């Protein structure tokens, strides 16, 4: 046993499973909002020695000796990200250990607030995250309320939109110490200016959580939530095009300059937050990951990352027109950014419905919640959104093409429910049938057929 | 911009960087016992396809559609785990979800446990982990503390093991609902028919953290904890030579039987465990870390792992033999597993002084704390370990030869003691004067002739 | 030293202190809505040998023995409590035991809620009491905040009247597990329908605090909270005319009768109550107290005490109506029970400096916050309320002469507001200068001439 | 209704309960060590017109107005209790609010500690007192409890004595914030000067309980807690014959003098301490249990006073003594202050049986734990007193009559054991059967005619 064989040899059963993988990628559309395809030379450095490595603290202030060259590596993954959000390093500062995204909000919290503190979210049902604090009626389902307390804010159900009214209406009966201000299945752009005024008056932190946006905002085709927040996680594997990590903003310098005679007050941010993430809440960082990210973030510091992230737009209302013609309703009237809620209801079939017989012709979608929704486990609306298939130089005239598949599978979906009842006989229709299995047929064999024709980013078989 | 280029071409800078860890590697000696070199057929299944599919949820309970590959993959990484270990499918179960070794053991508390409730394992000082609980006297500096109530138990300084007596006398006092058996710097075997004693006693779940032996117990070289447990956690990338992973092991099935007529009350551990991992505390697992562990754990159970783990125990047995007749004091008299701990008390030396030298001979060791220790700052031992250099076809008359090193470094270690004073003033003295700067660097160069003829598992440049 | 002395010739000092008191409340006009006097016939019982008697538990349940005659006095009050109020034994409770108001809620807290958990009630400047809940904007000053969680609902500043509209709103997003209902400063009658519906939505317990109007309760004059609560905290020396003490009400039997073939769901809220009280929170009882409270209960089963309580309602209505004519503002713009709430704004005279005139002419009264306020140390209001000078046989031709001596202080309080500046230079005017001082002592002694042509309840020394 | 009418003639009913009880406790000995009679003259003054007063805050500080006369009788009670205990009012402070001994002490916890903080006394099996802290196996039985850490120390079981060795170890492994030093059952004076050294390692606070031994503390026969302590918690009902009531005391001025150049660092005691009583925990003062206080405590200030505490300890060892000759054993081999432990387990019968069939012979005594107990329900001891019967004139030549009664009840309790089985058996043996019945009934004659015939401190009727 020398250690150096190739997996096709030593494991040839996994080597089978490796392959499938990457022939169902290419045969099928991607429609969902948080997937995207990752570069080649990011995988190289995602699996090298620098996994061999076990370094504990941060950069001269290691534990164990040797820590020489991945010293240089990770500060220069701090200089690539204070550069691609054209951030000034002597007010910003930068954490690039976070495993991922969830552990990067715990790590937030425990450094700002002791235990039992009020938050205040968006709610999950409205287009929120579950790491921004969720509970039942009989249960606590989220970490985030079981060691602090939680209270969320909602909608304008008429609108759409957020109710920035009622927002600022309970902040001061609840007075929070931290308010957050980011979204998972939202059309609109976020108005922080407003947010704003609501944490100066009780006196609270914003923090801004732009895990979906990520990709937008460097390209500055949308505005920066950095002009009126104070500290920022992301992820780096949504609209990045990168390994799977976590990042954390916050800034550093004087504060209330000129309180009284010549005093600087300053911020308090960092000392807090390098703490709470190692020793207290992880161990030893993964080198592997860190090498990947400064990878792709060098490569949205160029003028090829901003041709792409115009065209997520131009995708994006290209689809939203192609869909009212068909006569849908969108919810909110339209989209600003990378992603599309639609509203089935008027069409008489539901989000689940959809999602499955969507799901056997190769094209993924989730079912999404309507702001007059009865029952929660048929949701009336989809979302869809064009961060994946623009990587593989999908065009506008190519998005139109996917709503004719779309509009054809639903309708076959009204066809099950004149013959069938409750939705456990509707998913058994959908195979002993043979004259609806026979047409699911003819339809997947054309997508499969349109779709394998474009570049697929990556290696060539694993 | 295709997103098919190799890192040589794309990105210079890092493709630089990353050759000169791998050059690191090969011409040093590496005695920690945290660290051991990874297949290469693993690390290509760390950086594949399986980086770009967002799966949440568990197999055959998935939130979206299209998981059908994904799901044979985790569900084979469910067996090999519970062949690893020989353990029958109808009494355990295993999770293959958390990100690492602390966050798995953040997920047992949450399941079990409420908020402020008591905890109790072995103390930093003497051999214990940080996730088991620690506090300072002026500030708690672990997250086990932040969020439950810990009290440690600690060892006999006169015999430097672990003290059984004084345990069960403090555990009646403090009654906790959960006690940890694990250790991090210790060198014999824990006797686990005793703690699961005080256990039964004060009723309480026992917690096995075997990180460290986990190599060592699939190979069946010593005694298994899962004879008198309840939870095992532990990490895949020790003495497994995997990637970065957690593991989580729980019994289930009838407790115990026959309390009443014909009652059998069973198990609930199942429920708990999954459901705090998600949606509680994580969000998407890493599948591409996952297919990596499933290759790791497929070279547990070959007969060329058995002769691994037989010679990591013969290869600690003499280096130990080795110093006893150098003149050294060995901390409880010997070793029987892995690692060697060293006391350098009688020599005049302490461990601070002593790691340091050795740094600039390319031989990295840590410092390590004795129970005669009046100062943390500078301890008066080392922590020494034979996991990786094994992986390296290294035998016994090559670890006498590594002994040779140590001992004419730290008699360059004594010389500098008679002309400085303060620590500060003996890191400067190493490099500004010719004289001591121009012996080193005649070891320096023996130590890297004689560790670069020996076989490097992995790639081959990166 | 045989024990049996005299006051007047043990501790001549402490029986010229005794006698200075009883002088003062003879002299003096007592406009306190939470003050009354007491009966002789309840002081007997007061200070007598129960003192020197140490009972534990509850009767039939005693820890030490010999308490036979203790057992039918604490059962005998449980009897009287249940009848002052015509309630069914059956399907209610009462506890005895409690030494005042402020303990009989912390224990309800104890016994139905977990620690760190959500209680809602009104609002301090708005007419609430401290114990229901209340922080600052940098303290958390009572102790229902510090050991749970709490949250207010305020009032409707043009109507001033309960907005239970915007109750049932915020309800909603915080999910409380108990609601207070309960005043210390409203003029009208709280609607306990619309509350019930408010709990029965969010699945919450209602606690009714009537320490106010507990006297009116038990005579029949204004609707009563049990019709539409679960639980009942009161105090015994409000209007009812008794020794300081606490009772405790509770629902017992059937509770969601019929929920499935013969199922009967009971209430559980006898047992959690008593072991809150005992041996949780309190040691022993003091069962001199407890005897007192029998000798005030069983006067409020008399036709003389409702005769007593319709003359408190008509007292307030005519010094209500006194008050308008003479050019004032009430707030709500009447009363409907004991109390009339005042707004000196109209007259350009602030609530601290006509409290401290008044006092000076040995009429007391608290100054009372109004919606309008800007600053929280100058109220624009007063509190005066009709209870303790009903006692004295006041009807409604003396309650108008009052005002006369109101209105006179006033006039004399807008002199000075013109020749003074702050609020420190305005008490340091009414002393120094011999004309204003002049005018005060002509006001003084026909106020005490009037006062003291009325029986004063109690014993006639001390 | 004029509210001047005695109890006599308004309440016939209760009149007659009140006599009965006075005519128990002149016809029977009183042994428990909890109780003791109280003077004429502070009865007179619990019962007044105090009663009818409301103020709330601290003098100089009042709320509301006229509270002129309470403030002189408040700051007199202040003097006389610093004035008793020969205190430095330079150096002390006192509060003479808290309304029996438990709320006390809940008042110092809540004031120099955050919730869920760790707390360290007493066990309650072994002679501490319920509101120290403590637990059951399956419940939280203690409000100190719930809302703070709390874990006991012991005493030695082979000579009955505070083990103050192992306090001294296992503080340094749960390092609590607060040590309480005070006991309930204990024959044995408490060793300050020890516990001090304790909480100046680990760094804490010393509060000492004095609630029983408190009446000789005032008279110098036994050394003072205050030479070695922070804070003071005592009642003024157990040995200083007053109403019932609380006191704290706290030291006040410099701490650690000199500590850099001229520095002085205050103690912080006084203003915490003040607030947690009100408004945080309590809420009006009653004034009239105050006054009682001040009554009893210049009487703690004379000769007379110092001749009691003189006999109370002289009336203990007689009574010790002569048990011995008798034939008894004494827990930890004889008596220190004013209480006797027995031990009747070499005797053949348990406390259970003797407290039971001494009760019917009008003795009252309370069943104690002893260290070698397998059950609970049946304690093999007893807990003898002599504060109370001292007070009626008791002599050391009439304290070895009340053995002699003791011994001929135990006697005839030896027999009962010798014809019936399980303890519910041995109750209903005492009076079906008319032979035992009429042996009990000659016995309880001869202890009411000698006990008659001592005086009783209080009044003459009621």
New interface residues.
Partial sequence: ???????SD??P??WE??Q???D??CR?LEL?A????????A????????????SEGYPGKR????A???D??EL?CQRRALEAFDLDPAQWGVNVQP?????AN?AVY?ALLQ??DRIMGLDLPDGGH??HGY?SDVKR???TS??F?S????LNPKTGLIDYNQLAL?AR??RPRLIIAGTSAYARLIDYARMREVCDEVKAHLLADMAHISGLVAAKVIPSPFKHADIVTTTT?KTLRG??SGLIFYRKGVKAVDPKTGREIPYTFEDRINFAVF??????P?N?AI?AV??AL?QACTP?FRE?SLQVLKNARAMADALLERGYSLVSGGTDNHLVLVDLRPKGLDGARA??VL?LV?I?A?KNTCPGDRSAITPGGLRLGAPALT?RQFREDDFRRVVDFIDEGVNIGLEVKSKTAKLQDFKSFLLKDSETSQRLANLRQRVEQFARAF?M????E?
Wanted: net charge negative.
């Fill in positions: 046993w020398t250690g150096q064989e190739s997996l030593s494991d059963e996994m499973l490796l499938r993988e990457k169902r990628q099928g969902i948080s997937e995207n395809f990752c570069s080649r030379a995988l190289e450095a995602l699996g090298s020695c620098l996994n061999n490595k076990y534990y164990y000796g040797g020489e060259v991945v240089e590596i220069l495993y991922s995204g969830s552990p715990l425990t235990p039992h579950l790491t509970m389902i989220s970490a079981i060691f307390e209270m969320p804010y909602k309970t009966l609840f594997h390994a799977r020793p207290s809440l992880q161990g030893g993964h592997h090498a400064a990878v060098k090829m792409y999602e499955r799901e190769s993924t989730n990587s570049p980013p990556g290696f060539d694993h």
